[PDB]
Amino acid sequence: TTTLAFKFRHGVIVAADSRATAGAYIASQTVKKVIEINPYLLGTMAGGAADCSFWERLLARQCRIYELRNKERISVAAASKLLANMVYQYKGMGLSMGTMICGWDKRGPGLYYVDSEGNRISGATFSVGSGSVYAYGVMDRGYSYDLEVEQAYDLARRAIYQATYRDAYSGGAVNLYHVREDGWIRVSSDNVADLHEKYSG
Amino acid sequence: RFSPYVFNGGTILAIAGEDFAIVASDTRLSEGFSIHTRDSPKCYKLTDKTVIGCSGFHGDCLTLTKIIEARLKMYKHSNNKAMTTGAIAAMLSTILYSRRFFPYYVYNIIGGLDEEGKGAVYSFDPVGSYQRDSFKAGGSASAMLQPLLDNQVGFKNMQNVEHVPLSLDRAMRLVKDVFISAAERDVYTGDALRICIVTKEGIREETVSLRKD
Amino acid sequence: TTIAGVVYKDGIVLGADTRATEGMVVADKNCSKIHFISPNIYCCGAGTAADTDMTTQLISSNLELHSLSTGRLPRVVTANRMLKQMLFRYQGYIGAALVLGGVDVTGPHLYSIYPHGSTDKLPYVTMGSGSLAAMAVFEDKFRPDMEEEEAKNLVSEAIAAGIFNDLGSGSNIDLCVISKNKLDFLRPYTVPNKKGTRLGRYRCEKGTTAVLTEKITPLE
Amino acid sequence: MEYLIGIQGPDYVLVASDRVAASNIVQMKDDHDKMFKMSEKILLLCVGEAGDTVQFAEYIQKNVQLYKMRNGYELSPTAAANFTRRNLADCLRSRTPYHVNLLLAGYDEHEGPALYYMDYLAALAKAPFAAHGYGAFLTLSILDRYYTPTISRERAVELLRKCLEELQKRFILNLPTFSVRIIDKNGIHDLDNISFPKQ
Amino acid sequence: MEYLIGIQGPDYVLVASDRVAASNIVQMKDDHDKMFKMSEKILLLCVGEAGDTVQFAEYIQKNVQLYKMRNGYELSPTAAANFTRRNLADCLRSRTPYHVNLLLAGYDEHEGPALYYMDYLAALAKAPFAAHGYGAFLTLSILDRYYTPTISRERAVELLRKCLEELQKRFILNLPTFSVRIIDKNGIHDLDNISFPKQ
Amino acid sequence: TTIMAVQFDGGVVLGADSRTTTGSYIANRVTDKLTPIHDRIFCCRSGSAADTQAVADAVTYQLGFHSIELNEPPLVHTAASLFKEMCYRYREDLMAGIIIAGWDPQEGGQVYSVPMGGMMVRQSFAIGGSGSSYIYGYVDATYREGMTKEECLQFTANALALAMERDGSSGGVIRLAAIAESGVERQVLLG
Amino acid sequence: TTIMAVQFDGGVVLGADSRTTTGSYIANRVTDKLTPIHDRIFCCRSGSAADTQAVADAVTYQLGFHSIELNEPPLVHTAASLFKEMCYRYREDLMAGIIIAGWDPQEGGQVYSVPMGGMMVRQSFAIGGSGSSYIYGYVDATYREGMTKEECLQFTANALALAMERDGSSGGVIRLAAIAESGVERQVLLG
Amino acid sequence: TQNPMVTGTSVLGVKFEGGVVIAADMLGSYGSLARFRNISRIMRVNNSTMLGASGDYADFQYLKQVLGQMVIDEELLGDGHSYSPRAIHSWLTRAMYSRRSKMNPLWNTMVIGGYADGESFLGYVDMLGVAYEAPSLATGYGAYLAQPLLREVLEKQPVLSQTEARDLVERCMRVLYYRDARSYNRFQIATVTEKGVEIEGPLSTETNWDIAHMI
Amino acid sequence: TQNPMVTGTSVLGVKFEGGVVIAADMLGSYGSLARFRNISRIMRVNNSTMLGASGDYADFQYLKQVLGQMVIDEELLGDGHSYSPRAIHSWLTRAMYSRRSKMNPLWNTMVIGGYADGESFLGYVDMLGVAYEAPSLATGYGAYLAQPLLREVLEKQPVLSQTEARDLVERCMRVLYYRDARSYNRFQIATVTEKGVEIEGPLSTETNWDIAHMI
Amino acid sequence: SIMSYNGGAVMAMKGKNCVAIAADRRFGIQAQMVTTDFQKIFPMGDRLYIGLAGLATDVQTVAQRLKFRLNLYELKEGRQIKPYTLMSMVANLLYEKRFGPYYTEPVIAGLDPKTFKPFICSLDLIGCPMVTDDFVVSGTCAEQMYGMCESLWEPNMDPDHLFETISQAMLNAVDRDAVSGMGVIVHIIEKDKITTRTLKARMD
C-alpha cells in the first residue's frame, strides 16, 4: 500500500497502486484505491478497505446533501473537517484510516490529510502507506511548484514505480488521476512490468 | 472460556463470463477434526439472476442469508421491482459494516447478471468492502485456486497466448478440474459439488460427486 | 492418522493410514508409518513424525545390537522396557505415540505407548487422531481368538471407518501380519479412492515463458 | 515531544512554538501552526495527542468568541485560563479524557500581562516562564541563568536566539524553524520566522 | 538509530558514517568515529547496541591483525566477511547474544572492491548498496533512483551530497555532520568532513 | 483409580479398580493396577501412570538386589522405606499414590500408605485414588476390628463396588489379591 | 456446611451441621443452617452465606404473599420453582446449595434439590455441602426404601456424625427437624 | 452461561421408514461426581416433534418451560394448525444465536426429532447456532464414537426398518457405556411415528468383559 | 517444598520450674480432608531436648531421620558429651537458612524444647530462618489464638509449676479445638524434666455447647 | 512467522528421466527487500543440488555445515554419495538440534550416481524426511504451489515441458505470494548436462 498526492501550479496529481494483501497473502492485483467521491473530489484508500470505503461514501452522501441544500459546491476544508469529526467519534475502538482528500476550491487547490488519529492538517505534499517513505524520498527529489504537466506525470509514475520496487506490500496497476479547476480527469492506468521494461533501460 | 467464533471452513468459487455467472461450492460442513454432514450447500438462489454464497462461520451464514432475503422482500414489496446486483452488494456492505465492532466471520461472494445482462462477480471481505472482479475463490482453499485461475482465466504470466472469450462448457470443465485438484490437497473440501449457473433464462444447478474422504 | 493393533489366534495384525499432514494441508499421500524393529517385532508411530522415527530407529539399533550379541530371537518386553525408560527419561517432552507388537517364543504380545511413559498390554489398541472410529469398530465386533482373514477384515474395516471419519488418508490402507513363522507386509492393500480423470489438458508449450539468462554445463 | 517557550516580561509575553507535524518516522509538515488567536489580547498554545488539540481549539476558541458576542467585551486572561482548566478537569474523569498540554498567554488593560501553564492533569500555574516537551528540560536552565523580571524585549529576543542556538546543539530531534509571536498594549504582533542553518 | 552509508563503485567503495553518540535525550558527542580500519584496504562500520560495537571492534579488528601478523598477507574481503558472519552466528544462540548491524568494505588485488552487509541475525549479502535504520528508507529511495554501475567517483560524491541534502529535509533526528572515506587501489583515503548549514 | 488395602489377623487383602482414563476418554478398560514386587509384597498405584511404573520398576530392582544379597526374605517396612525415599526425593516431579502391603514372616501382614506427598505411615486399612473419598466416608462405619479373610473380601467387594458405581472416573472391573502365610490369591470378580 | 434431607412415609426429616467458617478460622460455632419459610416448609443452604440469606428472605416474601393471596396452604413444588427462578435468572454471582423439603397436605412429604447451577429435581434423599461427598458415598449403601421416622433420625444421625467427624470444615453440633402432618419437631443433639 | 455446572452427555437420534428414534441416558454428573442419577433428558413435545439435549440441564429445563408455553398457546388457538418440527428447529436456532450474540450463551447441544406429514425430520442445534439436517445425528463424544457406525450402516443400507434402527441404537449406547467416562448403564428410548410419540422405560445394557481374563 | 501437601496444625510450648511441656494433636489433614487422624508429631530426642513441628509431615519425617542419626553418632562417640538444646537450635536454624537460600524451602514450623544443666530451653525455628527464645511459643494459628492466654498468665505470674502449666495447656488445646478448622479432639502431651523425657497418651477435650440452646 | 521473516520458496519436481528444482531470488527483512541475487540452491556433488528456505542464517549455516560433513564423507570414501545417505545425514544434522532447532526446510533433488534415476525428498525443521514422486515444496507459501503442481503435473515429462511446467507454477505461485518474489532461478539437470535459467518475473 503506497499512495501519494502533491499540488502544484497546474492542479493536483493523485496516484496509487492497486495491490491489497491480507497478512502475507495477496488478495487481488486490481484494487481501485482512489475512491471517486464526486466529479470534483477524489478520496483514497489508506489503511483498511472497509473503513475508508464506508466513511468516504458517508462523506460523499453528506457533501451531496450540502450541495443540494445550498446550491453551492462544498469546499475542501469543510469536507476534511466533516470527515475528521465523523471519524473522531470512534477513537480507541480500533479504526485504521489514513486517507487523503483532494479537490478544487474557491481558493483554488486544496490538499488536506485526515487520519483515524485525527491529524487533520493542510500541506503541499503527502504520502500514505507502508512504503510511503520511498515516495517521499524520490518525490522530494523531484518536487517543485513550477513543474510542467508531463514532468509531473513522470514524477508520480517514477515515484510509484520506485515505491513498489522496494516495498513488498505494494504493486499492481499504477492509477493516475489529475485534478483541474473544473474537474478531475483520469490520466492512465499503468502496470509495473511495463514500467520496468520502459524505465529499466 | 467460551469463544464466540469457530472455523467451519469451506470453498466457494465464482466465474464471470460474457453472459453467465457460474457459482459453485462444496457441501462439506466440518468442525475441527470431525465431519458434521456431507450435504450443506453454500449457494442460495435469491432472485432469478442472483446467487449468493456464504462461507466461514455457519450460524452467521444462516442469519445473514435470512436477513438478506428479508430485505430483498422489503425492496420488492416497497418499490414494485427487484434489486440489481450492485444494490445487493452495496446493501451487504452496509450490513457487514453495520456489525463492524462485532464482525461476521464470513467470506461472501455474490455472482449474478447486471442490468446489461452480463456477468458480474462481486467479492467481499469480513468487514464490508467489495469490488467488481472477474473471478474469486473464497475460503480455506483460496490460495490453492487463485493462481490456476490466474493462469487459465486471466491468461497471466504467459507469452504469445491470445485471449479467447470464456465459453460455457470450457468453464464447466475448468470448474470440475479445479475442484478435483483442490479436493486432493485440502482437508475442508469434498464429498459433493453444487454448481449454480445463472443465464438469461433462469438458474441451473448441478450435482457432481467427489472423493468420499 | 489412525493406527490399530490386534491379536488373532497366532500373531498380530497391524494397520495404518498414510496421510502425513503438515498443519492444515495434506503434505504427503504415502508415508510408511509401520516401522522396523526386528524380524518379529514391528512398531507404529503417531503424533510427531520425526520423534517416532528417530526413537524407533534407535531402539531397533539397540535390539539388533543385543540380538547379535546374544545369538537368538529378541523379546518384546525388553523393547517395552527400553521405550518406557527412554520416554520417562525425556519426561514427556518428546511426543511419540507408539504401538509395539511382536511374536516371541512365548507368543504374541501387544503394547501401546503413550508419550509420557504409560504402557499397557492389550488384545487390541487404537492410536492417533482418528483412533476413535477404529476403536468403535473394535469394541463392536471383537471376539477372542479370531482367524486370519477375519482379523484382516476387522482391521481393514476399522481403519476404513477411520478414513470415513475425519483426518484419515487417501491411501490404500497398509497392513502387516506377523505369525510365529511367516511375516507378511502389504502396502497396496485396498484402493477405494481413485483420482478423477483429467477433463482437458493444461499443458504448456515450448516457449510460453520469457527467459532472461541461459547456461549449459556438460558432464561425464 | 516538541516544544513551546512562554517567556513573561514586564509588559509583554514572548511565546514561540515550532512548525513541525511529524509522524513517527518522517516530518510530514514543516510549516505547521499551533497558534490560536482567541481574542485581540489573548493567545493560546497546545501540544498533546494531536487529534485532541484541534478539538480543544474548536471548543475553547469558539466558546470564547461566543462569550465575546454574548456580553460585549473580551474575557480576562485569568477567567479564560480557569475555564480551560475547568473543561480539562471535567473532561478528565470520564470515558473520554483529553491528553493535551497547554499554556495561556494574555494581556489585560488593568492587570497587564499574565502567563499561565496547564498540564495533562488540569493544573493552573502562574509562572515566570514555562515550557513543554523534552527541550523544556534543557532550555529552562538556560533561561533561568539569564533572567531578569525587568527585561527588555530585545534582550528577550537575544536570549531566545541563544536558547535556540543551544537547542540545535544537544537535542535529538530536528526542529528547523520556529515561529514567534509577541503581545503588547496594542495586541498580537507576529515577529519574524526564526530558523537557523546549523552547520 | 542512525545510518552509515556504503555506496559501491566500479573500482571504489564509498563509505560514510556519522559522528553522533547521543543517549535518548541529548547529543553527548558530535565528533564520534565508527570507522574501524581493519587493514590497508579493508574498512568496517558498526551500528547497534553501543556497548557491543566496541567489543566487536576489539574482537574482529585484533583477530584480523593477528592473522595479518601470522601468515604474510592481507585478508580477502570475502573471508573476512564470512569470519564476521560466523562469529555473529556462533555468539547468537547463547545466554550472551550480540545485537549489532554491520557492513564491510574491502578491496582485493584480484576481485577489486567488495561490499558486504550483515544484520543482527548473521546474514551475508553482496550488495551494490545496502542499508539499515530509517535512513535506510530515505537513502535507498534516492540511491535506487540514481544508480549507474559505471559511475565515476565525483558523481558518487555529488550523489551523496544530494542524498544528504534530502536527509536533512524530512527526518526527525538531528544528524549534523558526516565523515566520508574512500577505498581505491592504494588504500583508505579520507575525504573532507561533510556537514551542511541547513537554512 | 480407586485402590484399597485391608489387613486382617492372618494376612492382608488388597483390591483396585482398573479403568485407566485420560480426560474424559477411557484409554484402557482393564489394567493390572496392583503390582508384584517380591513374591509376598504388593503395591497398588494411582495418580499418574508413568511415574508409578518407573518407581515400581526401580523399587523392584533395588529390593530384589537387596533381598538376594541378604539371602533372606525381605521386610515390608523395607519396601515402604524405599518408596518413601524415591517419592520424597522427586516430589517436584512425581505423582505417586503408592500403598504397600504384604505378609511377612517376622511381622505378619502389614499395610503402609504413601500418598502424593511422600510421608509413610502404618495403618490397618487404606484408601487411595480420586474416587476413594466415598468408601473413605463409610470405611470407618462398616469396618470391624479382627475380620476373617472372607469378611475382608466381602468388605472390599462392597467398597470397590460402590466406588466404581459412584465415581465417573472409577469403574471397570474388580481385582482382588489375598496375601497370607499360605499363598498369593488373585481373582477377578463382578457384582 | 453438610446438609441433608430425607423423606419417609408420613413426612420428611432434615439435618445439618453448624460450623460456618471463613478460610481456616471458625467465625461462628453454632448456626441455624436450615431456615423456616412457611410454618410447614423448610430450606437448608450451603455455598456462600449472605447470598442464600437474601435469596431465602426474598423467597419468604414472595411465597408468603402468594400463599396469603391464595387463601390456601401453599405447595412445596411452588417454593422449589421460586428458588429455581431466582437462582437461574441471576446465577453468575451466587453460590447456592439450596435444598427444599417440607410436608404438604396434597402430596405428603417432598424433598427438592437445587444445586449451584439452577436445575430442579425431586429426590427421596439428598446431600449438600462441601463435606457431604462421604455420606454421599454411603447414603446409597445404608438407605432402605420405606423407613420410619426413628430410622430416618438414626440414619441422618449416623450420616452427620461421620460427616462432622471426617471433614475439617464440618463439625459443630447436630440440628434435626421432623416435619409431618401433625407438627414440626426440631431438636439439637450434642456428643 | 459461561461455565456449565451440571452437564449431560451424548445424544443419539436416527430416522427410519416413517419415524425417528432418539435415545439418551439419564445421568446428571457434576464434574466427575455422578450426583443426579435419575433425571429425564428427552422432552416429548405435543404430538409430532420431540426434543433431546445435552450440556447444562438447567438451560434444558428453561427451554422446556418456554417451548411448553408456546406449544400450549398454539394448541389453545384452536385453528387445527401445529408447529412443524422444522419450525421448532428454526425458532430454536434463532433463540440460541440471539443468546450468543449478547455474549450469554446457552450451554447445550440439542437434537430435534420429528415425523409430520409423511416425511421424517431430524434437526440439530448447536450452542453457537450451527444448525443443519442429517439422516443420523450424534452429539458430544457420540460424534466421535457412535457416528461412524451410523455412517457405516447408512452407507451400507440407505433405508431401514424400525427394529434395525432400535437395535443399532442399542449397540451404540452399549459402546458409549464401554468407553465414555461420563456415561451410565441406564437409558431411555423415545420413538415417534404417525401413531404418536412414545417414551420407553429406563432400559439398561448387557456387557462383556472376557478380555479381562487375559493378562 | 513449594506446595505443602499434608499439613499439621498448631504446637504449644511453655516453660515452667525445671521443665518444658509441649503438646500437639494427632491429625494429618490434606486440604480439608482429615486423611491421617492418627499420627505422632513430637520426637523425643535422647534425654534432654525434644522436638515438635508443623507444616509438611514428610519433611518432619526427614528431619526426624537426620537428627536421629546425628544424636546416634554423638552417643556413639562415647565422650560423655551430648548436644545442648541450643546447639540443636543452632544446627536446625543453619539447616533451614541454607535450605531456603537455595530457594527450595522446607515447609515446616518447628518447636524445640529442652532441659539441660538446670536451665530450660524453648526455641523456635521458622521456614524463613526466623529464630529466637521465648518463655512461651505458639505456632500456626496458635500465635493468633492461644498466645494471649500464655502472655496473660506469664504477665500475671512469671514463674509456674508443672500442674498449672499442664492445666493451661489443656485449656489452650480445648480452645484450639473450639475454633480451629484444622483441629481434632485427640492430642498428646509431652514433658521434659530432669527425670527424663515423657510422652503422654492420646488425651482428649471436654467441650461445652450450652450456647446452642439459645437462638 | 519466524518462517516468514525473510520469505522464501523452493520447489523441486521429478520428471521422467530428469529432475527440475527452482527457487526465488528475493532477500530482505520482513517487509524491506535488499537484493535479488541471494543464493539458496547449492551444489552438493555432481547432478545433485539442495535447496534451503526459511531463516537465511540457518540456510547459510546449515549449508556450510553440510558441506563440511559432505567433503569429510567424500574424502573418507573415494566414491560419491548416494542421495538417501545425504537425506539421512541432513536428518541427523537437524535432529542434533532437537530442542535448539534451526528454522529451515531443506529440499534435496538429485540423480542416481550409477543410473539416471531421479530423486526428490524434503525434510522438516526437526528432521522428518518425506520422499515422493511428483514434487516437493517448502518455504512460506505452500498452498499456492500445492494447487499449481497438483494442477499441472504429468507422470512422463520431457525436460522442455518440465521446464515450462515448473516455470508457470513458480511464476504464478510467486506472483500471488507477497513476501517472496523478485525473480526466479531454475536448475534443470539430467545425466548429460546441467542447465540454469533465470526467468523474467514480475519485479513488483
UniProtKB/Swiss-Prot annotation, chain A:
Keyword Transit peptide listed? The answer is no
Q: Which family does it belong to?
A: Belongs to the peptidase T1B family.
Subcellular location as annotated: Cytoplasm; Nucleus
- Where on this chain does bortezomib bind? 49
The UniProt record lists the keyword Ribonucleoprotein: no
Specify the species. Answer: Homo sapiens (Human)
Q: Name one GO biological process term.
A: response to oxidative stress
Record's subunit section: The 26S proteasome consists of a 20S proteasome core and two 19S regulatory subunits. The 20S proteasome core is a barrel-shaped complex made of 28 subunits that are arranged in four stacked rings. The two outer rings are each formed by seven alpha subunits, and the two inner rings are formed by seven beta subunits. The proteolytic activity is exerted by three beta-subunits PSMB5, PSMB6 and PSMB7. Directly interacts with POMP. Interacts with ABCB1 and TAP1.
Q: What does this protein do?
A: Component of the 20S core proteasome complex involved in the proteolytic degradation of most intracellular proteins. This complex plays numerous essential roles within the cell by associating with different regulatory particles. Associated with two 19S regulatory particles, forms the 26S proteasome and thus participates in the ATP-dependent degradation of ubiquitinated proteins.
Spell out the reaction equation it catalyses. Cleavage of peptide bonds with very broad specificity
Lineage: superkingdom: Eukaryota
| Enzyme active site | 1 (nucleophile)
| Keyword terms, alphabetized | Cytoplasm, Host-virus interaction, Hydrolase, Nucleus, Protease, Proteasome, Threonine protease, Zymogen
- Known EC number(s)? 3.4.25.1
Please list the GO terms describing molecular function.
endopeptidase activity; peptidase activity; threonine-type endopeptidase activity
Protein name from the UniProt record: Proteasome subunit beta type-5
Swiss-Prot record, chain C:
Q: Where is the protein found, in the record's own terms?
A: Cytoplasm; Nucleus
Record keyword Cytoplasm present: yes
Task: Give the EC class as a word.
Answer: hydrolase
Tell me the Gene Ontology biological-process terms attached to this UniProt entry.
proteasome-mediated ubiquitin-dependent protein catabolic process
Which keywords annotate this record?
A: Cytoplasm, Host-virus interaction, Hydrolase, Nucleus, Protease, Proteasome, Threonine protease, Zymogen
- TM spans (from-to): none
- The catalytic residues are 1
Asked if Endoplasmic reticulum is a keyword of the record, the answer is no
EC number(s)? 3.4.25.1
Q: What does this protein do?
A: Component of the 20S core proteasome complex involved in the proteolytic degradation of most intracellular proteins. This complex plays numerous essential roles within the cell by associating with different regulatory particles. Associated with two 19S regulatory particles, forms the 26S proteasome and thus participates in the ATP-dependent degradation of ubiquitinated proteins.
Instruction: Name the family.
Output: Belongs to the peptidase T1B family.
The protein's name: Proteasome subunit beta type-7
Q: Which residues of the full protein are shown?
A: 44 to 263 of 277
From Swiss-Prot, chains D, E:
GO CC annotations, alphabetized: cytoplasm; cytosol; extracellular exosome; membrane; nucleoplasm; nucleus; proteasome complex; proteasome core complex
The superkingdom of the source organism is Eukaryota
What subcellular compartments does it reside in?
Cytoplasm; Nucleus
Inducing or repressing factors: Up-regulated in ovarian cancer cell lines.
Q: Which UniProt keywords apply?
A: Acetylation, Cytoplasm, Host-virus interaction, Nucleus, Proteasome
Residues that the record marks as modified (N-acetylmethionine) are 1
- Where would you say this protein principally sits, based on its record? cytoplasm
User: Which InterPro entries does UniProt cross-reference here?
Assistant: Ntn_hydrolases_N, Proteasome_beta2, Proteasome_bsu_CS, Proteasome_sua/b, Proteasome_suB-type
GO biological process terms on file: proteasome-mediated ubiquitin-dependent protein catabolic process
Where does the record place a coiled coil? none
Record flagged with keyword Cytoplasm: yes
Q: One short Pfam family name for this protein?
A: Proteasome
Instruction: Look up keyword Acetylation and say if it applies.
Output: yes
User: What role does this protein play?
Assistant: Non-catalytic component of the 20S core proteasome complex involved in the proteolytic degradation of most intracellular proteins. This complex plays numerous essential roles within the cell by associating with different regulatory particles. Associated with two 19S regulatory particles, forms the 26S proteasome and thus participates in the ATP-dependent degradation of ubiquitinated proteins.
- Name the family: Belongs to the peptidase T1B family.
Q: What is this protein called?
A: Proteasome subunit beta type-2
From Swiss-Prot, chains H, I:
Q: Where in the cell is it found?
A: Cytoplasm; Nucleus
* GO cellular component terms, semicolon-separated: ciliary basal body; cytoplasm; cytosol; extracellular exosome; mitochondrion; nucleoplasm; nucleus; proteasome complex
What keyword terms does UniProt attach to this protein? Acetylation, Cytoplasm, Disease variant, Host-virus interaction, Nucleus, Phosphoprotein, Proteasome
A single BP term in Gene Ontology? proteasome-mediated ubiquitin-dependent protein catabolic process
Question: What's a single GO MF annotation on this record?
Answer: lipopolysaccharide binding
PTM sites of type Phosphotyrosine:
57
| The keyword Nucleus is annotated on this UniProt entry | yes
Please give the superkingdom of this protein's source. Eukaryota
Q: Does Thylakoid show up as a keyword for this record? A: no
Induced by what? Up-regulated in fibrolamellar carcinomas.
Q: Which disease is it linked to?
A: Proteasome-associated autoinflammatory syndrome 3: An autoinflammatory disorder characterized by onset in early infancy and recurrent fever, nodular dermatitis, myositis, panniculitis-induced lipodystrophy, lymphadenopathy, and immune dysregulation. Variable accompanying features may include joint contractures, hepatosplenomegaly, anemia, thrombocytopenia, recurrent infections, autoantibodies, and hypergammaglobulinemia. Some patients may have intracranial calcifications. PRAAS3 inheritance is autosomal recessive or digenic.
Q: Family, per the entry?
A: Belongs to the peptidase T1B family.
What name is this protein filed under? Proteasome subunit beta type-4
Q: Which organism is it from?
A: Homo sapiens
Which classification does the entry list for the species? Eukaryota, Metazoa, Chordata, Craniata, Vertebrata
Name of the encoding gene: PSMB4
**Which span of the entire protein is present here?**
46 to 260 of 264
